[PDB]
Design a protein around this nucleic acid. Structure first.
Lengths: 366, 366
DNA sequence: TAGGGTCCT
DNA sequence: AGGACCC
DNA sequence: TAGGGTCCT
DNA sequence: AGGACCC
């Protein structure tokens, strides 16, 4: 029943991809911006004081030289993101993506095949690769320690390969479920890896400073938990099941409470090809509601070649908006047109009618 | 690109199944009732004046003797319904169910395989089986006439088989798409079949007296079409695309207008096993909101053995209600419990809280 | 936030 | 269609 | 309606 | 979760 999961987390992904593109930014502190924000930056930059999501001022002006590169167009990041997942799929087919820069891989079957291959004696020579969370001592007679170490060796091989084959660095964490792998992958932040032995599972989970830090608990649940006095992970562990059950629902409640103990039985799901392709433009009020339809052909133009590219074709289109909350108009894509721009353009137009930012989404792929 | 579709429609299905069960009702006019209604009845009954969905009074008292059998419990109907579909699947794998007593089968591939088998001469001997809609003349040199006739021969074989193997009678209609097959299957109502040649497609579609009669157009669309002056099928054929587009949406609009011409490109979809299992009880106000939870264990008890039976197990439960409009509380089914009553019972209870008729639905099968 | 994406209700 | 969660 | 069911938004 | 459509 016990698993060996790895979580692979790429350092400052977009900046890595931009530094690979213009090398002259290698030494230089680098910010990737979209609109007014520095959504990410390389280490130099971060060191000289910057954070994911500061103002191109509160941050340019917080610092020198700061090179800015525009990262509005996600295309290259999205391609590199899939190169990484495909590489990890080669290790073990079941890989789950979480945004463009994180992947979970279930290493359970692969660890077991390795251990079977190892003869009677070299098993005592199995070592760790990377850090051991909390500096915990290994016990070579613990079968679970031996699996998690083999799991740290797969992880180092994945990271070596992502570096040798794609030029990317990244962190990894090995643990017995997704929550823990993800919590432990960032303990040694830059381009390193860590492995979580079971005896340190409470230490990790209690190293959190707020339940918002638990993946699975977002902006809302957190605000609600607060309203009940629950603030630390230990308040959530000890809070009353009932009262919680009867406030967040049995589902929400009885899952987030297991999380608070480090227990998480959710499988790593095979993500495979994406379920949708969309594009977007912000513009703090810039749609006169009228003129701004040209932005609509915009988005289509890019999308169409993406949607094409795939093979698979979309059976639904959808349009989305915001106001000086979002709204969406869903609709089937007419038969024969799947098989160019011009028809589409006008399906999207009336959709527009039936209704600070705009988007087209192509979904329901077949 | 042209298809041969059959639509198979069983006569007064529940009554057939009840007449097979108690033979003494064979000669006798038979009503199947659920609560206060005669949801269906055998021909004798219908003849001596009865209709699908009259009051057990406005109808018992509209007529003699009238035997009543309770059809609240759908179990036997549901089993016989699947026996019928499985039989038709044996002819050609792609069969779509529409409620418990109707099935569409795409006979395209099977008709073509038959025609290929027929040598050069016997092709002139191909005949029809059953009625030809509108008494239309056949043209043996029309490839489309020849396909639809072979299609009427498959249809007679299906009906013979449903009769010989399962004791059920029924109607069939063969046509080039689902709309037309379904419109034409009831032209000779009792236990007969009809085939639609293309030249009579407008005659059939114009034989309708209201656009509500077009499968695809329901209670709402109809009321809306009316609000625009559209009443006959010919008003809908001739109504303006735009105005219609810009009232029902492009999707709704441009599909129902094709229907009004007898054009319908929707594929017969393989229904396979069901996507959900649910049970229900009416009771014009009888839930004190409190006591009535016993009805909840009720429904579960039956369901559980159904859900079991299948193989596949449900990952979601859901509860539904009405008021002296419906409401549903959706929720995941806790891991380990999939693998009895007692846990469930209480998951359903709190669901109850977060909130003339009651139901449990098990869905999201895996 | 930005510019994506995913699953549930 | 909209809500919630993730990066 | 009753007692089911299915797909879309 | 609720709307619309079918039997």
């Amino acid at each position: 029943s016990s698993r060996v999961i790895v979580h692979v987390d790429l350092d400052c992904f977009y900046a890595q991809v931009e530094m690979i593109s213009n090398p002259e930014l290698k030494d230089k502190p680098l910010g990737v911006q979209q609109k007014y924000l520095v959504v990410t930056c390389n280490y130099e930059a971060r060191k000289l004081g910057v954070k994911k999501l500061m103002n191109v001022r509160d941050a340019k002006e917080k610092c020198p030289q700061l090179v800015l590169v525009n990262g509005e167009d996600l295309t290259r990041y999205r391609e590199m993101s899939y190169k990484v997942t495909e590489l990890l799929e080669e290790f073990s087919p079941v890989v789950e993506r979480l945004g463009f820069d994180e992947n979970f891989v279930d290493l359970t079957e692969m660890v077991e095949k390795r251990l079977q291959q190892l003869q009677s004696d070299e098993l005592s020579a199995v070592t760790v690769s990377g850090h051991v969370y909390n500096n915990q001592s290994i016990n070579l007679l613990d079968v679970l320690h031996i699996r998690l170490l083999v799991g740290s060796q797969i992880a180092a091989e994945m990271r070596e390969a992502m570096y040798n084959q794609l030029g990317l660095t990244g962190c990894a964490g090995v643990a017995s479920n997704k929550l823990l792998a993800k919590l432990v992958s960032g303990v040694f932040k830059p381009n390193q890896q860590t492995v979580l032995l079971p005896e340190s599972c409470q230490h990790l989970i209690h190293s959190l400073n707020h339940i918002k830090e638990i993946p699975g608990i977002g902006y809302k649940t957190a605000k609600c938990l607060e309203a009940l006095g629950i603030n630390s992970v230990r308040d959530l562990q000890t809070f009353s099941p009932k009262i919680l059950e009867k406030e967040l629902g049995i589902s929400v409640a009885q899952r987030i409470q297991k999380l608070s103990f480090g227990e998480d039985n959710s499988p790593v799901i095979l993500s495979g090809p994406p379920q949708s392709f969309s594009e977007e433009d912000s513009f703090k009020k810039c749609s006169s509601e009228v003129e701004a339809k040209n932005k609509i052909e915009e988005l289509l133009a890019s999308l169409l070649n993406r949607v094409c590219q795939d093979g698979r074709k979309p059976h639904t289109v959808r349009l989305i908006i915001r106001r000086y909350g979002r709204e969406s108009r869903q609709c089937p894509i007419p038969s024969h047109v799947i098989q160019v721009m011009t028809p589409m353009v006008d399906i999207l137009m009336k959709l527009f009618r039936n209704m600070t930012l705009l988007s087209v989404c192509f979904c329901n792929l077949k």
